Design a protein around this nucleic acid. Structure first.
Ligand SMILES: [Cl-]
Ligand SMILES: [Cl-]
Ligand SMILES: [K+]
Ligand SMILES: [K+]
Ligand SMILES: [K+]
Ligand SMILES: [Mg+2]
Ligand SMILES: [Mg+2]
Ligand SMILES: [Mg+2]
Ligand SMILES: [Mg+2]
Ligand SMILES: [Mg+2]
Lengths: 158, 160
RNA sequence: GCCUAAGACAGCGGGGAGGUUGGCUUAGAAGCAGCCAUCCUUUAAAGAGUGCGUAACAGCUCACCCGUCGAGGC
C-alpha cells in the first residue's frame, strides 16, 4: 500500500513526536530521516507553520517529502511583522499592507489557488486580508476587490 | 419557463455557433477538485459549460434549426447523465486524446461495473479497495459525441 | 396569486470544491463551545456552513447543482 500523510509542522524545527510520530512511526519508516528531510527543506521558513506531505510506500519503507508554503494568513502576518491579528475583524485594524505586498503574497501562492490570473489571486488574498482586519491601502480590502474590477490598478498587472 | 432558462439557453445556443467542432462530454461522478484541474488544463483549447440536459437538447435543437442543418440536431440523441456542452476547433481525435490525457485515477464505486472486466464490484469489495488507497478506474471528462463537418463521432470510433 | 413536461413536488444516487485549520480565543476550537468577520476564486452549484459526531481531527449530514422518475405541488 501507499500512505500520504499531510501535516502542519513548524518550519525547520520538526521533531519525532508528536505530529510526525503518531502518523509516520506506524508505517515502519525511520522517523528521524523524515524529521531530517523536513527540517532541510523548511530552513527558510524557520519558526512558521508550514504544510508537509509525506508519501510513504509501506512495503518498501520508501518515502518522499513534498513541502508547501505557509497559510496566507501567516504570510500576511509576516510582511506586517505581527504576533496576532484582529481580535474582532473589521472592528479594528491590525496593520495595513500596500497593494504591492498583497501582490507578493498573491504571486507567492497562485499555484495552490484555483484562480488562474494574478489579479483574482490577489482578490483571494484580499479576501483573507479582510478576515483578520488588515487594510490594503487605507481601504477595506473588500473595497479594493471592486477597484481591481473597475481596472483602477491595471498598471501593476501583466 | 423560468427566467434563467431563456437566458441560459441563449448562452448555450451562442456557444454551439461559437466554433466548428461541438462535443457533448460527461462530468457526472467526477470529484470537484478534479474538475478544477481539468478545467484549468483545457482553458485555451475548448470552452466547457455544464447545464441541464433538457435545456442542452433545446439549445442544440434550435441551433441546428437556425443553422439549417440536421447534423447538429443529432447531438441531442446522445445526451445523458452529466452532460455538458464543450466546443472548440481541435478535431475530434485530438479532443479525445486531450480529454483522456486529463483523466486522473480514482477509487471504483460500490455496485459499479468494473471497466477492467465486466463484473459488478460489491459495496464491501470497493469499501475495502477504497480503504487500501487503491484507485483503478480512469476518470475525467467523458465524450458522448462530437460534431465535425456534417457528421457525428461516437467514442465507439474514436479510441482505436 | 407562484413553482410546474424548458420537469415541479417527494423519495433516492453523484457533485458539495479552492485561498483556508478565515481572524480571535483556546490545552484543543479544523463550517458545527464562544466572540468577530462572512470575502474572493473554480463553477452547473457548493454557506467562511443546517444538524449529527470528534478530545481536536475524521466520517455522516444539510443548503445548493446534476442526475433519475413523470403530475401536480402549494
Ligand atoms: Cl452519425
Ligand atoms: Cl454532478
Ligand atoms: K492557479
Ligand atoms: K447535465
Ligand atoms: K481557524
Ligand atoms: Mg452524498
Ligand atoms: Mg470551532
Ligand atoms: Mg465541536
Ligand atoms: Mg461563488
Ligand atoms: Mg461548502
Amino acid at each position: 500500500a501507499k500512505e500520504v500523510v499531510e501535516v502542519l509542522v513548524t518550519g525547520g524545527r520538526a521533531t519525532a513526536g508528536p505530529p510526525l510520530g503518531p502518523a509516520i512511526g506506524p508505517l515502519g519508516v525511520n522517523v528521524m530521516q523524515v524529521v531530517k528531510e523536513i527540517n532541510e527543506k523548511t530552513k527558510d521558513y524557520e519558526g512558521m507553520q508550514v504544510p508537509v506531505k509525506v508519501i510513504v510506500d509501506t512495503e518498501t519503507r520508501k518515502f518522499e517529502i513534498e513541502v508547501g508554503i505557509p497559510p496566507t494568513t501567516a504570510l500576511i502576518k509576516k510582511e506586517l511583522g505581527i504576533e496576532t491579528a484582529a481580535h474582532e475583524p473589521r472592528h479594528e485594524v491590525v496593520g495595513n499592507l500596500t497593494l504591492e505586498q498583497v501582490i507578493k503574497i498573491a504571486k507567492m501562492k497562485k499555484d495552490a489557488m484555483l484562480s488562474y490570473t494574478l489579479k483574482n489571486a490577489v482578490k483571494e488574498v484580499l479576501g483573507t486580508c479582510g478576515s483578520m482586519g488588515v487594510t490594503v491601502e487605507g481601504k477595506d480590502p473588500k473595497e479594493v476587490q471592486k477597484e481591481i474590477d473597475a481596472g483602477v490598478y491595471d498598471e501593476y498587472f501583466k | 419557463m423560468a427566467p434563467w432558462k431563456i437566458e441560459e439557453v441563449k448562452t448555450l445556443k451562442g456557444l454551439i455557433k461559437s466554433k466548428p467542432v461541438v462535443a457533448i462530454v460527461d462530468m457526472m461522478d467526477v470529484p470537484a477538485p478534479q474538475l478544477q484541474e481539468i478545467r484549468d488544463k483545457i482553458r485555451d483549447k475548448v470552452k466547457l459549460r455544464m447545464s441541464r440536459n433538457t435545456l442542452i437538447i433545446r439549445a442544440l435543437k434550435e441551433a441546428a434549426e437556425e443553422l439549417n442543418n440536421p447534423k447538429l440536431a443529432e447531438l441531442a440523441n446522445y445526451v445523458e447523465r452529466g452532460a455538458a456542452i464543450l466546443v472548440t476547433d481541435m478535431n475530434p481525435f485530438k479532443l479525445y486524446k486531450l480529454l483522456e490525457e486529463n483523466k486522473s485515477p480514482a477509487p471504483v464505486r460500490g455496485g459499479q461495473i468494473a471497466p477492467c472486466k465486466g463484473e459488478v464490484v460489491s459495496p464491501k469489495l470497493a469499501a475495502v479497495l477504497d480503504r487500501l488507497g487503491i484507485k483503478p478506474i480512469k476518470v475525467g471528462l467523458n465524450i458522448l459525441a462530437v460534431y465535425e463537418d456534417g457528421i457525428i463521432y461516437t467514442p465507439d470510433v474514436l479510441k482505436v
